[PDB]
Amino acid sequence: ALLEICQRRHFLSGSKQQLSRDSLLSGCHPGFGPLGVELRKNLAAEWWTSVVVFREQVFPVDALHHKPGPLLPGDSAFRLVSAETLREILQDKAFLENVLKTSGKLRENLLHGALEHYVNCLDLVNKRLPYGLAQIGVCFHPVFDTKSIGEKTEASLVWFTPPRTSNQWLDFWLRHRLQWWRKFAMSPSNFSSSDCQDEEGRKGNKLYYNFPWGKELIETLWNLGDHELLHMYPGNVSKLHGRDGRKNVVPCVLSVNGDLDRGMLAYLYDSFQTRKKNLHRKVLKLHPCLAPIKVALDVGRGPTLELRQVCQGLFNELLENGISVWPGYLETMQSSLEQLYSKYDEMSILFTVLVTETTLENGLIHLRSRDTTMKEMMHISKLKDFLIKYISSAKNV
Amino acid sequence: EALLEICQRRHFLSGSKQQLSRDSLLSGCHPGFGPLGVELRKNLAAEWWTSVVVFREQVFPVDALHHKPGPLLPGDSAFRLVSAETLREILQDKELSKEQLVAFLENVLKTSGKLRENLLHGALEHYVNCLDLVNKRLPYGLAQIGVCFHPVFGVKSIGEKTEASLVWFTPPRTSNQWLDFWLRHRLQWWRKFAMSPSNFSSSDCQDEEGRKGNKLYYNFPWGKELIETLWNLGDHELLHMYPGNVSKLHGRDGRKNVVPCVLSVNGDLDRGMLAYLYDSFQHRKVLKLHPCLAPIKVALDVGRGPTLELRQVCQGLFNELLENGISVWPGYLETMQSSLEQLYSKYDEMSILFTVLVTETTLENGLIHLRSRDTTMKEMMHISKLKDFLIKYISSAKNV
Amino acid sequence: MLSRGLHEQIFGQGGEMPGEAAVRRSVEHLQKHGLWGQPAVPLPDVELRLPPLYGDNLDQHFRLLAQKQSLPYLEAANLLLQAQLPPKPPAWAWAEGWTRYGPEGEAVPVAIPEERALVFAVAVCLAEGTCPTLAVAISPSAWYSWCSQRLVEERYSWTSQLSPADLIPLEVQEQLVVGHNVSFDRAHIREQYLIQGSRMRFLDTMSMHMAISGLSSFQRSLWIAAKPAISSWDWLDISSVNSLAEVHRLYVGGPPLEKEPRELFVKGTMKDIRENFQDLMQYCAQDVWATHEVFQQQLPLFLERCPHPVTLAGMLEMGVSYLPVNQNWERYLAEAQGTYEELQREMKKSLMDLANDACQLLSGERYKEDPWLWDLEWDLQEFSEEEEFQQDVMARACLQKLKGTTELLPKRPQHLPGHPGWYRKLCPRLDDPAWTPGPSLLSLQMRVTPKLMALTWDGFPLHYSERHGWGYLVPGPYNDVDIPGCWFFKLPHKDGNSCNVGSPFAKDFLPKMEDGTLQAGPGGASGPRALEINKMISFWRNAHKRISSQMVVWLPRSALPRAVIRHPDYDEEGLYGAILPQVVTAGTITRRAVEPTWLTASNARPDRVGSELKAMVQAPPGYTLVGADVDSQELWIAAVLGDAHFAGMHGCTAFGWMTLQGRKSRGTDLHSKTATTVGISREHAKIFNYGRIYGAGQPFAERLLMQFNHRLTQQEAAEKAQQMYAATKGLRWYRLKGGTESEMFNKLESIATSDIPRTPVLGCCISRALEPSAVQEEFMTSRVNWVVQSSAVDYLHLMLVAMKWLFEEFAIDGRFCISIHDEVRYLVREEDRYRAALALQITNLLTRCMFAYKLGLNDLPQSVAFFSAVDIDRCLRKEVTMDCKTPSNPTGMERRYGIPQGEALDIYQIIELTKGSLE
DNA sequence: TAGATCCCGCGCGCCGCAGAC
RNA sequence: GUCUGCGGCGCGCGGGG
Questions:
Q1: B82: domain CATH number?
Q2: Residue B394: how many CA atoms within 13 Å on its side-chain side?
Q3: In which residues does the motif Exo II occur (chain C)?
Q4: What are the helix (H) ranges across C621-684?
Q5: Among the four A274, A292, B194, B213, which has the fewest Cβ within 10 Å?
């Protein structure tokens, strides 16, 4: 259960040594390592391709990090410790931004941005009621400790569909999200969804992951029948009405928002495996389509050299071929190959390629796979093709 | 002038009501960009990351917090929009009722949490982690692209701009060589995606923090606009970040431990995208932008044929394009059918590399009409061979 | 009233001759078994003025209705029977549509066959969809042919209404149609998919053959093979195996029919049809001619076997069944197949991950001590420098020039070299089968998926060494059933499961997933879930071929009546279709409707992907399904027949007493109330009981008990004769078999071995293949089953004729009887739905009363006089309030909740003027 | 009970083919 | 003058309904 050791050893977790689970979940953690950043970027790209590139009638949505609109006191427990926190009984030597209208606000979700951009999306489209707005970005939320501002990466997709099929569209979106969570996951059973009802009676689905501590919500879907959209732009309804069919009606917006950082943490937890196995092997069996480092080039005994430039050339060729290769032939003095393989696997290294003294003539280099602890011999040629094929297999299925 | 209106009409830019003037677009106060602009910015960011991260060998990704918090921030020193109260953003607090503090006892000198306008502070903070990541490599560096907020002047608004900041660590002896190499790489990047590389220019500046620095400018139609700034900051900033740290900040170059020299290069991604769009724009209003950064690559349309067959062909083409990773504009499902010339003009205004039309002839024989905006030439191409031709064109554009 | 609970009627004279001796016998019988003294709850009395009966009795009333319904179809049948047929024309026509062949084969185009009777045959091209390609028909006048218009080369792309044939006039008399498997041709006749009813009825020589010397399923095998086991074979010369050629051979002595050797319809292309048009048309006409011969030899014999007009009227009505689908059948198929694919891929991924994790025993030789994969061979067969970016084209072309020995060494199994043999067998080649990284091409069907998961019990190799899953699998050579395992295999012992291939077995593994000593175990995450996947997947895996590829013909807007249109629920880009079940009216030795997919026992069950098949049979808007399942139909029929044999009172036998008075809760009911307490559990005691009224014995009961759970033969029905002793105490001697317990089965036994018609109600004769008079034989079990199941068929026939009479006497816009396992549904207009309930109740009153009128019972109990609940719904589900597994819920589709009525429907009458609501 | 054996997958042997080493 | 794996042709056994 001491998975934090692996996160600290590899550049996949935050820099701070003390990173509580609650702090990481709330987004108040110091950050994430380069491997974590790469994994988050890959997950975001996959989600965008599935929802934006794959789904038709869906367009990107951009929301400002902070809302300069006057609005009113927001979801802040303390109103800048000004209205409720007055220095002394009076100390009237004076709002100092006490009025919310006086200054901007820190956006917590893209729902306001989606509502604002709904009119623009409808105008751009050919009056079609079915429309989509996606936005992936960092949202800041207040976390109270017995206060702080925690930034978490979240992806929000809002689909405006006719009210008649609003429930069907919401169900389809929930099913698609559940399938996506199951895909690229070692144990899709862990990720599930649960029906929930809002305070006003709005129904929706919330996605949860069964972490070892317990079930934690990682996504939430809410369907609004032109309530928030009408509130944002209540002056006129003709311009806010979409043409689902022969007549124009007020669209219903189903917004699904998922915490990208929470999703990455859940995926990392799922990668690790747990009794009666009788074979302990610390390995992060992350999906190849999302693994940070796909190919790890290495060096032989070091007695003959020629491996550093080989690794550099392999990395350059992979970059020209769209494959990311970590040039591991520069570092030396390891004195052991088992430790290097274990580190690469813990770094989510799909394959490890080693060049020996027999690499010049009869270039059969050694290949090691994280999934199977068995050695292979592969020709120097077509290695990039093999990596590309493996990546394509991971991405497609 | 007309370029902004054309972009807004084709959904390239955001609403012109708030960003009617070019100043808003140049600064971070602009109200975002349109879907075509968003796609172009994403493509440019991906290309920059590949050139800086993929091309680099010892460079690893570095993540920096959006806002730097704590009371540690100096009193009224580089404190812009320093609220950290989850509400309000005061860019300037020159005149305030100093009863207990500038604004309040709790909200003054303790709660700053001001979003950094550059990633240099984040790079300095994460240099400790990056050294371990690069195995104490003195020539290592860290690059990251993110949104930076700056104050713009009654009330001082906060303008957000997407900028890419790269901190390269090199030995002080070779620091000048590293700066020159970075300048050459920046020139190469400017000439890679610019129709006229002569428009991009570089200037040399001197400052106390950095003796030699490079500033990149683009010759926009309105005038020269700064798009990149390079500062060869010394080890003083590292010493300030780490007080009394011995052999920690210093990097190992040539088996010798010495204080690394960190050069910070910051480039405005939005400014570069705007400059590229302006360069592309120039009787027919068509923006001859680079295919790699073009928001729209291939557009599929159905006309002059069976409705069901045309819809099926368009769906198949879109699925094939998606499987290959090339975005396809959903031209189908539109019943307006105003005119072929209008569709071509819209595609040109949408930065569409090529226009694809499928008709009854395509259903009969599989050959569809392919038109090139840059060449304004229309030919007949096989549906199966259309993807191969697009891939070949993309490869040629990438490697020219 | 009363006398242990009876209803009050409208029909009937004085009568009332119970008999003092009969009452004394019944009372002293009810003294034992159940308790004679039960106050019971008197049900509310119902005052109902029945519609005017005809004749002097109920039997004559039923005989008059059925004659009125069967007169014109019998007239048409006799018109065909007394007809002469000219020779076949020399050359068939090529024109589309219908072509009539006058004298000397003169071909003239005609619109439709303007004949009162026909013998019809249709041929379909399996490769090109399911649209028909050519049909041949005959009447007393001449010959007719039809070409289907697909012989031209044009695109049609399915989903049409003029694709099928045309056989009904414009009606501006009764249009009998005769055929073999005439349901299949009815699926193509057209004017049968219309929701508005039509007067054409169909006579299937398959149905008549099953009635007239049909064959059982255990007898079909013995008939095919001969094209304790000692049997008499005098039934071979009267019985066939239901094939057109064979039926023609059996009923007609002549040359055997020739068959098309190339089989251009089942395995061929439309071009082959165009080339061989004349030969295929000749074959179709030969089939029609043999059908006419068989019909001529069948119809008078048919009417001899089933003299009651009611049987013929019921067969005519049951030949027109209708299943609306309404735009969600395709959606149900699509979601079901998508879920199937997703679950299959998830299970495959889990299996590949298990295989990958199974490789860690190679790293330490630890496979030998592993009880799971010990027997596997597990042999490890093998099977600076500048980047120099140049000569890429030469390197690429070297691979193409590497044909011969350069590529011979790698071949298929080269990737991942040095791995154990089994893992390499799972791994495909690099080039041909793509790469599919990992041990792909792995499924449950392989012998290696066991020992990668599951292995419950003690030792579970699942190796097909003439024994499949080997193991004693119970307590007490060495390590045969030991928990550590790793058997020496010194000598095979097939202990524990000693039945081997003798037992019929079944998918008892699927319900044994829940406990039953069948789970993965040490896996924790991916092991048990694969078994969960199999449990959820097996049904659709097995049945997606049948449920998919169902013939759905979507009616256009012009083909719908004014009721479906102008309704609140309409359009929404909606497709209102129909499925004719292709159901043979008589498809068994008993004349039961037989359909492999629609007429099986299935319902919407959680953890089953392919379930809710019965759902999505949704009535068109403005119409609804009014239907009911008879409350223990076969149980009550056995009880009443047994009660009639014992005395004149209904509850005399103590088995009909429990069927009448016993209740599910606070009541001695055989189903889910008692027979679980002596037995094991409910929903298995139901199956236990239904097997005894259909005929069974200690062997079948013991095997059923063994299937229920893991119990030895002593705890099974070998030492346990108590179920046999306390129920079905037959074959008792020294009594000058009859009863001697709750159940009176001797009435069925005396019915079977009597050589008479043997049907107590309608007098439908048994098949000549089973008659003792035709052949002395010991197929008694099938005949005992036949008596009750054909009495059930006769109950259905009575219900059908009564419902038709009530719908025609009173203008109730309903039709299309669908019968599913003793349940009957009628698609009726909404405005009359309550009447259709009342009529249905009245039908259940008359039908039971008819069942009462025969066997000598002039009164009927109040409890069974009416249906417990009349299900009025917009869908076909077992209960009015149920759900499904694949969708979120029924309200994901437009499915509301119905109502089961009860005695509320009794606040009306059957005339159009009910409570003044009409007009 | 009605209770099934045409299509549909698990295995084996058997005979015929390239061809360097 | 071989034996490593691939293309049609026989056998056995359950399994759906």
A1: 3.30.930.10
A2: 17
A3: 178-186
A4: 633-646, 656-661
A5: A274
Please state the domain count of chain B: 2
Residue of A190, A274, A373 lying closest to C360 (CB–CB): A373
Distance CA C438, CA C349 (A): 10
User: What tokens were used for A54?
Assistant: 């794959």
Resolution in angstroms for this experimental structure? 2.6
Strands C176-179 and C117-124: parallel
By Cβ distance, the residue of B15, B103, B113 closest to A149 is: B113
Rounded to an integer, what distance in angstroms lies between the CA atom of residue C786 and that of residue C748? 9
Q: Any idea which residue has 């309804």 for tokens?
A: A237
Intra-chain end-to-end CA distance of chain B, in Å: 31
The CATH number of the domain where A324 resides is what?
A: 3.40.50.800
Whether C92 maps to a domain, the answer reads yes
Q: In B242-366, which ranges are E strands?
A: 251-253, 256-258, 261-268, 296-302, 328-330, 352-358
Token readout for B167 is: 């901190």
Give the span between the Cα atoms of B324 and C42, in whole angstroms. Answer: 76
Last residue of a domain, one of A262, A291, A320: A291
**A245 and A348 share a domain?**
no
Contact map slice: B 79-108 vs A, CB within 8 A: 83-90, 96-107
In this structure, are A300 and A184 located in the same domain?
A: no
DSSP-derived letter for residue A128 is B
**Residues found in chain A:** 397
Residue C570 located in a structural domain: no
Whether residue C360 and residue A189 make contact (CB cut-off 8 A), yes or no, is no
Q: Does residue A143 share a domain with residue A75?
A: yes
Three-class DSSP category at A106: strand
Instruction: Report d(CA C167, CA C112) in Å as an integer.
Output: 6
Cα–Cα distance between B340 and A123 in angstroms, integer? 21
Say yes or no: B269 and B326 in one domain.
no
> What CA–CA distances, in Å, run from C443 to B390, C453, C538?
39, 12, 13
Q: Note down the domain range covering C202.
A: 83-305
Domain extent, residue B259, equals 2-294
Q: Please list, in sequence order, all residues whose beta carbon lies within 8 angstroms of the beta carbon of residue B167, skipping any fewer than 6 positions away.
A: B119, B120, B123, B124, B127, B141, B142, B143, B262, B263, B264
- State the CB neighbour count (10 A cutoff) for residue C554: 18
Domain match, A19 and A102 both: yes
Task: Please provide the size of chain C in residues.
Answer: 919
Residues A269 and A350 placed together within one structural domain of the fold: no
Q: Do the Cβ atoms of A60 and B39 come within 8 Å?
A: yes
Within 10 Å of residue C878's Cβ, how many Cβ atoms? 14
Closest CA to C188 of C176, C179, C196, C197: C179
Say how far apart CA B125 and CA A378 lie, in whole Å: 43
Task: Name the closest residue (CA) to the C1' of nucleotide E5.
Answer: C411
Position C459 in a domain: no
Among A228, A263, A291, identify where a domain stops. Answer: A291
Residue owning tokens 């009909």: C656
Tokens 């009616």 map to which residue?
Answer: C555
The approach used to solve this structure was cryo-EM
Cα B193 to Cα B373: distance, rounded to the nearest angstrom? 18
In the Cβ-directed half-sphere of A101, how many Cα atoms lie within 13 Å? Answer: 0
Distance of alpha carbon C74 from alpha carbon C28, whole angstroms: 51
Distance CA A143, CA B165 (A): 29
Residues B268 and B308 in one domain: no
Q: Please compute, for residue C911, the number of CA atoms within 13 A of its CA located in the half-sphere on the CB side.
A: 8
Which residues sit opposite A142 in a β-bridge? A149
- CATH number of the domain within which C248 lies: 3.30.420.390
Residue closest to E14 C1′ by Cα: C468
Residues A239, A322: one domain? Answer: no
Pairwise CB contact (< 8 Å): A307 & C385: yes
**C537-576 residues near strand E (Cβ < 7 Å):** 538, 542-543, 546
C-alpha closest to that of C617 among C812, C317, C893, C338? C893
